Paper text:
C-terminal Src kinase ([name]) and [name]-homologous kinase (Chk) are members of the [name] family of protein tyrosine kinases. These proteins suppress the activity of Src family kinases (SFKs) by selectively phosphorylating the conserved C-terminal tail regulatory tyrosine. [name] and Chk both contain SH3, [name], and kinase domains, which are separated by the SH3–[name] and [name]-kinase linkers. The [name] [name] domain is crucial in stabilizing the kinase domain in the active conformation.
Mills et al. studied the unique disulfide bond of [name] [name] that is absent in other known [name] domains. Crystal structures of both oxidized [name] and C122S [name] were solved and refined. As the structure refinement for the oxidized form of L-[name] progressed, the maps indicated dual conformations for the residue C122, which were successfully modeled as such. Therefore, the high-resolution structures of oxidized L-[name] reveal dual conformations of disulfide bond that were not observed in the lower-resolution structure of full-length [name]. X-ray crystallography data were also consistent with the NMR observation, in which most of the changes in chemical shift took place in the residues close to C122, and this area was likely to undergo greater structural change than in the C164 residue area. The S–S distance of the disulfide bond was 2.0 Å, whereas the O–S distance in the C122S mutant was 3.7 Å. Formation of the disulfide bond assisted in the packing of αB to the hydrophobic region of the protein consisting of βC and βD. The disulfide bond formation significantly enhances the thermal stability of [name] domain and assists in the packing of αB into the hydrophobic region of the protein consisting of βC and βD. The crystal structure also revealed that the linker region fold back on the [name] domain. Additionally, the hydrophobic interactions between L77 in the linker and L149, F83, and Y116 make the linker fold back to the [name] and thus stabilizing the structure.
Residue numbers in the entry: 73 to 173
The structure:
């Protein structure tokens, strides 16, 4: 049927930044979704609603390792979400509630 990542509730796939802003409304503390840029796959962007607005955290790749702060690194995107769900660790909020997809 698909990959583990494709069936994740927070993963929306190839949607634009403007469409991500429309989904994460009204602003909810912890409401988040992960969008993929149609670059180039898989240029991901962690879209999370904090302090009344949507903050966009762009995923970067250093030697096939995923990060959004150049401090904490992950093997894959699903490890990134799992980590930031539990603790903020520099982010504006914990990834509390995923936007249903």
């Amino acid at each position: 049927a698909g990959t583990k990542l494709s069936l994740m509730p927070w993963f929306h796939g190839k949607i634009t930044r403007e469409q991500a802003e429309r989904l994460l409304y009204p602003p909810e503390t912890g409401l988040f979704l992960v969008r993929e840029s149609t670059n180039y796959p898989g240029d991901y962007t962690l879209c999370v609603s904090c302090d009344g607005k949507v903050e966009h955290y762009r995923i970067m790749y250093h030697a096939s390792k995923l990060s959004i702060d150049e401090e904490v690194y992950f093997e894959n995107l699903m490890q990134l979400v799992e980590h930031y769900t539990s603790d903020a660790d520099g982010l504006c909020t914990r990834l509390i509630k995923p936007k249903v997809m």
